[PDB]
Write a protein that holds these residues in place. Structure first.
Motif, PDB file in Angstrom:
ATOM      1  N   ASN A  69       0.793  -1.224   0.000  1.00  0.00           N
ATOM      2  CA  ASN A  69       0.000   0.000   0.000  1.00  0.00           C
ATOM      3  C   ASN A  69       0.834   1.288   0.000  1.00  0.00           C
ATOM      4  O   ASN A  69       0.270   2.387   0.001  1.00  0.00           O
ATOM      5  N   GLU A  70       2.154   1.163   0.074  1.00  0.00           N
ATOM      6  CA  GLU A  70       3.021   2.296   0.128  1.00  0.00           C
ATOM      7  C   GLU A  70       2.997   3.045  -1.202  1.00  0.00           C
ATOM      8  O   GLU A  70       2.897   2.448  -2.265  1.00  0.00           O
ATOM      9  N   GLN A  71       3.205   4.379  -1.102  1.00  0.00           N
ATOM     10  CA  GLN A  71       3.583   5.242  -2.226  1.00  0.00           C
ATOM     11  C   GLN A  71       4.818   5.994  -1.772  1.00  0.00           C
ATOM     12  O   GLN A  71       4.761   6.661  -0.749  1.00  0.00           O
ATOM     13  N   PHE A  72       5.922   5.843  -2.496  1.00  0.00           N
ATOM     14  CA  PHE A  72       7.143   6.570  -2.190  1.00  0.00           C
ATOM     15  C   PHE A  72       7.300   7.682  -3.226  1.00  0.00           C
ATOM     16  O   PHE A  72       7.371   7.400  -4.423  1.00  0.00           O
ATOM     17  N   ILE A  73       7.341   8.927  -2.745  1.00  0.00           N
ATOM     18  CA  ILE A  73       7.349  10.074  -3.652  1.00  0.00           C
ATOM     19  C   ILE A  73       8.351  11.070  -3.094  1.00  0.00           C
ATOM     20  O   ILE A  73       8.273  11.486  -1.943  1.00  0.00           O
ATOM     21  N   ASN A  74       9.298  11.516  -3.937  1.00  0.00           N
ATOM     22  CA  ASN A  74      10.303  12.487  -3.504  1.00  0.00           C
ATOM     23  C   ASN A  74       9.694  13.862  -3.306  1.00  0.00           C
ATOM     24  O   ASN A  74       8.725  14.218  -3.967  1.00  0.00           O
ATOM     25  N   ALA A  75      10.245  14.611  -2.371  1.00  0.00           N
ATOM     26  CA  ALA A  75       9.929  16.022  -2.207  1.00  0.00           C
ATOM     27  C   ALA A  75      10.508  16.823  -3.372  1.00  0.00           C
ATOM     28  O   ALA A  75      11.691  16.693  -3.690  1.00  0.00           O
ATOM     29  N   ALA A  76       9.674  17.646  -3.986  1.00  0.00           N
ATOM     30  CA  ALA A  76      10.101  18.603  -5.010  1.00  0.00           C
ATOM     31  C   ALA A  76      10.422  19.971  -4.435  1.00  0.00           C
ATOM     32  O   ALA A  76      11.293  20.665  -4.986  1.00  0.00           O
ATOM     33  N   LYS A  77       9.734  20.424  -3.392  1.00  0.00           N
ATOM     34  CA  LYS A  77       9.939  21.712  -2.731  1.00  0.00           C
ATOM     35  C   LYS A  77       9.812  21.487  -1.255  1.00  0.00           C
ATOM     36  O   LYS A  77       8.979  20.675  -0.829  1.00  0.00           O
ATOM     37  N   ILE A  78      10.606  22.154  -0.457  1.00  0.00           N
ATOM     38  CA  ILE A  78      10.638  22.039   0.983  1.00  0.00           C
ATOM     39  C   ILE A  78      10.722  23.465   1.492  1.00  0.00           C
ATOM     40  O   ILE A  78      11.692  24.174   1.204  1.00  0.00           O
TER      41      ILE A  78
END
Ligand SMILES: [Ca+2]
Ligand SMILES: [Mg+2]
Length: 223
Positions: free
Chosen positions: A61-70
């Motif tokens: 059930n995981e979705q791994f998504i990188n941060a684009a803006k912090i």
């Protein structure tokens, strides 16, 4: 979380794990493209892990998504921890379903004594260190402003609330930082600071999210 219990799998569908090689902080999904967390959690690179229960096992059930803006709050103060809040834009939208869902921002601030749910993968031991695989939960009330301000003389600003228990044994800890405090369906707190965790007369201090809805929405609209 010290003195908590293991949440039912995916029962906190807005809870995310922020990962930099390992879990380091929590956060809350508040839009398909945005997570809110604590500014003291800032790292320049973050992978957001949604739909987690066991952060050590890929369960489906995981979705791994990188941060684009912090984006840390422009008035974050790392001494006083005032304005301990940060927004993370996802490089692609989270796909919303039963296990990955947004949590509402506050419609108002919460009354003293309101029941809340605090969650995270932070330290579970009141002595030493134990970092759980499974998401932990804690039911805790918003404390009176006598109880909060007396616990930390001169240190509680208008942008902070205490949630927890003056007797000790029940609190958020290191690694829960940035995670949610949800009361009556609303994100009212972000795990921020205190004096250790679960100590007597040192309840957890949380960023008071009901002060930040304008800042959050303005940041989302501009980015
Ligand atoms: Ca997992
Ligand atoms: Mg571990």
């Amino acid at each position: 979380i010290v003195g908590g219990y293991t949440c039912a799998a995916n029962s906190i569908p807005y809870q995310v794990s922020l990962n930099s090689g390992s879990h380091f902080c929590g956060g809350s999904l508040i839009n398909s493209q945005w997570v809110v967390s604590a500014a003291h959690c800032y790292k320049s690179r973050i992978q957001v892990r949604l739909g987690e229960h066991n952060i050590d096992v890929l369960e489906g059930n995981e979705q791994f998504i990188n941060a684009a803006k912090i984006i840390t709050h422009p008035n974050f103060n790392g001494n006083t921890l005032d304005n301990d809040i940060m927004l993370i834009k996802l490089s692609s939208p989270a796909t919303l379903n039963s296990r990955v869902a947004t949590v509402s921002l506050p419609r108002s601030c919460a009354a003293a004594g309101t029941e809340c749910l605090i969650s995270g993968w932070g330290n579970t031991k009141s002595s030493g260190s134990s970092y759980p695989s499974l998401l932990q939960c804690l039911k805790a009330p918003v404390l009176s402003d006598s109880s909060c301000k007396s616990s930390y003389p001169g240190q509680i600003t208008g942008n902070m609330i205490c949630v927890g228990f003056l007797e000790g044994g029940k609190d958020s800890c290191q690694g829960d930082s940035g995670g949610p405090v949800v009361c009556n369906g609303q994100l009212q707190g972000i795990v921020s600071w205190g004096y250790g965790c679960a100590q007597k007369n040192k309840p957890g201090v949380y960023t008071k999210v009901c002060n930040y809805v304008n800042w959050i929405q303005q940041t989302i609209a501009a980015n």
